[PDB]
Amino acid sequence: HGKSVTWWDEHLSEENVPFVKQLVSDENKAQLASKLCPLKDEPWPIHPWEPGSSRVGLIALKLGMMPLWTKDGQKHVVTLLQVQDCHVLKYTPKENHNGRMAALTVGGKTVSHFHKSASILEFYQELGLPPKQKVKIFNVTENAVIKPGTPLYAAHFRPGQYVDVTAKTIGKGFQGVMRRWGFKGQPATHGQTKTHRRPGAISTGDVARVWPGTKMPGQLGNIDRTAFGLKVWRINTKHNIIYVNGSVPGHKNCLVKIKDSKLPAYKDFCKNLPFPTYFPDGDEEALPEDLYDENVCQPGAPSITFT
Amino acid sequence: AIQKMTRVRVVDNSALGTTPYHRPPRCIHVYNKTGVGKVGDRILLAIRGQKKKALIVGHRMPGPRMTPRFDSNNVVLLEDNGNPVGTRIKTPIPSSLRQREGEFSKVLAIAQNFV
């Protein structure tokens, strides 16, 4: 038995190719809109807010960057993060993860069934969601737990707050020493021969080995990084778009991990936020289409006059 | 960005500014820890074989949007007291300079046109 390679679309005919697609997308919209109502389904017990609590996070899409002006006249540049499809996936009890905090696994953007693994499609069939592209694990306290297969919207971070972002930084491949590290070069013109880039002496004569940490040319930039202490300026409710401050590591259009700030200055800031998470059903109110921080100049306004 | 060995042009009306010399006045030292000076920074000028202190007024390097960018690098002659050794400054000065009153007070007081 020499078994052949098979992809999903190999044996389908002209007739059946669109049918399969229409069918899969149909079942997808159905399964999505079905999970659209968490609170009336089989909601888990909601717990009050204690001071040592830690919230759930979000998975976003980096759109691009845009300028934004404060009422004070200063100009900030901000990054638009969008929440496309966000659902909590599985749940790990306290003892079963860190011995300390409970793991909540969150899914990202929707992909096609046809290219994933058997095991994974099994995992989503026992859930009822479409497969998510990027899946990250958040650490969370017992009072912040949610129920697996629950939707997470972008109103989750109320405007003004500090968040943290983790993502894979822009990959630059195999880079020389002057990029990767930032060693000065050798001078260009004075009779230097074939040296204008190279690291130069890499060690000491006695040691006769080169040390286990030594900086050398190599892989640069595809790695995880985290930006701390970013302020959130404004929120869009309809398109689910956060405007965070400064820059977020990754290429634009990349998938990005958002949490509340773990920085020591902000420790208790989570007392004012909708805590298990935000629930559009529960409040039964329409949030204004944009939530602005008190500082921001709104896209329409008096056109500032100092005095 | 005005740095060591930049030829600067002295805008205020002074003895040392207008009188000719075989050397254009050169900047020796900038007092920022960065070797680069900006508008409202402080310089040590070599003029006519002696050292005077100066205040950078405008320069040819671009700066934050809505800052005026000038055709030439312009300095005002200054002594240690912070007193301008000149009577008055004709060519226009960045309105941003009015931010710091403390150091530049007198310099601002003799300034004619702002932009």
Binding site: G2, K3, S4, V5 | -
Partner: protein, 110 residues
């Protein structure tokens, strides 16, 4: 830099018999429904493309004969004919190439 020691045949067997330097077994090979020769799944059949190619070459020769010189090329659409065929009205007003071989089964009339 000059190698400090001859390497043993052991070390060499290790290096050049590595699973990476071995030729991988291609799993995408199939047979072509017409001539039953072998072809890779994403590539045209070699043997089929051959008879197609030969016929294209010959039809290009005869249409090289129908043209007088190097720079002279037809403004009409062309339609190629085989023994026993007469032009349809859809195809008339066009340049016609006449050929001896009766129309090959894989080339349709349309």
């Amino acid at each position: 830099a000059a190698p400090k020691n001859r390497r043993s045949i052991e070390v060499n067997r290790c290096r050049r018999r590595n699973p990476q330097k071995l030729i991988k077994v291609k799993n995408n090979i199939d047979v072509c429904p017409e001539c039953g020769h072998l072809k890779q799944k994403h590539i045209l059949c070699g043997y089929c493309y051959e008879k197609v190619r030969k016929e294209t070459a010959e039809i290009r020769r005869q249409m090289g004969k129908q043209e007088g010189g190097p720079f002279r090329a037809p403004t009409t659409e062309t339609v190629v004919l085989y023994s026993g065929e007469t032009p349809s009205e859809q195809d008339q007003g066009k340049r016609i190439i006449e050929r001896e071989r009766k129309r090959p089964s894989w080339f349709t009339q349309n």
